[PDB]
Design a protein around this nucleic acid. Structure first.
Ligand code: NA
Ligand code: NA
Length: 327
DNA sequence: CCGACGTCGCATCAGC
DNA sequence: GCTGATGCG
DNA sequence: GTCGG
């Protein structure tokens, strides 16, 4: 619908969510508030009362009472109190640094480290990831327009093919689904020589090549199947430099690749629905495999999958393009 | 009432 | 040194 | 916090 409709409510809930996650360390309270904000963000009416909102799935008595207070007064007392409280605001703010989660942010604030300037003054208290998150603080909160994501895809597919024309690489996420912008880049990689019953630097070689051409600029973490790092499109010799961007690269067994591509293409709602329909047809899908279910509920051996459509055929569903996987 | 709520690879730390 | 827990994305 | 066994 429209922000003007329930943006005040959805903004209030998202702020309460962040405080649960970052200050309370109550991840489930956080996900509850976020779910409430999302169902409400999709409701195509300006909500008039908590009782109206409570009909919606994920809004309960508490959030109904909060909505009543917000509508009548324009604010939530408890959010106003958290907002001004120096400890809570600082903890919440510091978690915006990649690699600083609620635990580190609490420790920093417990010793007087509250601001980016405080972090910048205390480099030796930061691990390598947190230093990189600090270095690119502003860049990492920017969205990536699709035209840039295309240019980034072009570099990644070219360099991957240059290492070995046998690699398969798929940029997934909302971008795959036609998203006009993105938050990071999620690259899924496989090779025929890598199966579930068969890593030989096949991830390292792609990362190295991407580093050798100066696309990947920093490494947050890297092992034999998952890389998290920083990348940046090349400038134009005389043009504002592009911002640095977060990029993940996953190496997946070939026999699990299209289940991985399906899963990490999403959306989250679409995945829940396809998983649900799959159970009601006798199958279980996870990020790795589709397996048939016995009459007693015992999952059998994973079934051969060589394309996304294969999965749809198993469950007797017509192939849905990434565009049409919003839900 | 009261437990579930998504999963996991990797970096780092606790403990031995 | 090694194994397991915890934090984090 | 919300849901549901
Ligand atoms: Na409800
Ligand atoms: Na963070």
């Amino acid at each position: 619908p429209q922000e003007t409709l329930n943006g005040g409510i959805t903004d209030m809930l998202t702020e309460l969510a962040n405080f649960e996650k970052n200050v309370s360390q109550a991840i489930h309270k956080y996900n509850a508030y976020r779910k409430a904000a999302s169902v409400i963000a999709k409701y195509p009416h300006k909500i008039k009362s908590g009782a109206e909102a409570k009909k919606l799935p994920g809004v309960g008595t508490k959030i109904a009472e909060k909505i009543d207070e917000f509508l009548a007064t324009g604010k939530l007392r408890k959010l106003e109190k958290i907002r001004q409280d120096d400890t809570s605001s600082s903890i919440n703010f510091l978690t915006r640094v990649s690699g600083i989660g609620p635990s580190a942010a609490r420790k920093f604030v417990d010793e007087g480290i509250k601001t980016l300037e405080d972090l910048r003054k205390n480099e030796d208290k930061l691990n390598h990831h947190q230093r990189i998150g600090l270095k690119y603080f502003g860049d990492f909160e920017k969205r990536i327009p699709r035209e840039e994501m295309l240019q980034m895809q072009d570099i990644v597919l070219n360099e991957v093919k240059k290492v070995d024309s046998e690699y398969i690489a798929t940029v997934c996420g909302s971008f795959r689904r036609g998203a006009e912008s993105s938050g990071d880049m999620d690259v899924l990689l496989t090779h025929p020589s890598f199966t579930s019953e068969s890593q030989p630097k096949l991830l390292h070689q792609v990362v190295e090549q991407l580093q050798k051409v100066h696309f990947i600029t920093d490494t947050l973490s890297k092992g034999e199947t998952k890389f998290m790092g920083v990348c940046q499109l090349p400038s134009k010799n005389d043009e504002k430099e592009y911002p640095h961007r977060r990029i993940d690269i996953r190496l997946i067994p070939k026999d699990q690749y299209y289940c991985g591509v399906l899963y990490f293409t999403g959306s989250d709602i679409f995945n829940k629905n396809m998983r649900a329909h799959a159970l009601e047809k006798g199958f279980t899908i996870n990020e790795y495999t589709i397996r048939p279910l016995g009459v007693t509920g015992v999952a059998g051996e994973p079934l051969p999958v060589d394309s996304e459509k294969d999965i749809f055929d198993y469950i007797q569903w017509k192939y849905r393009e990434p565009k049409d996987r919003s839900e």
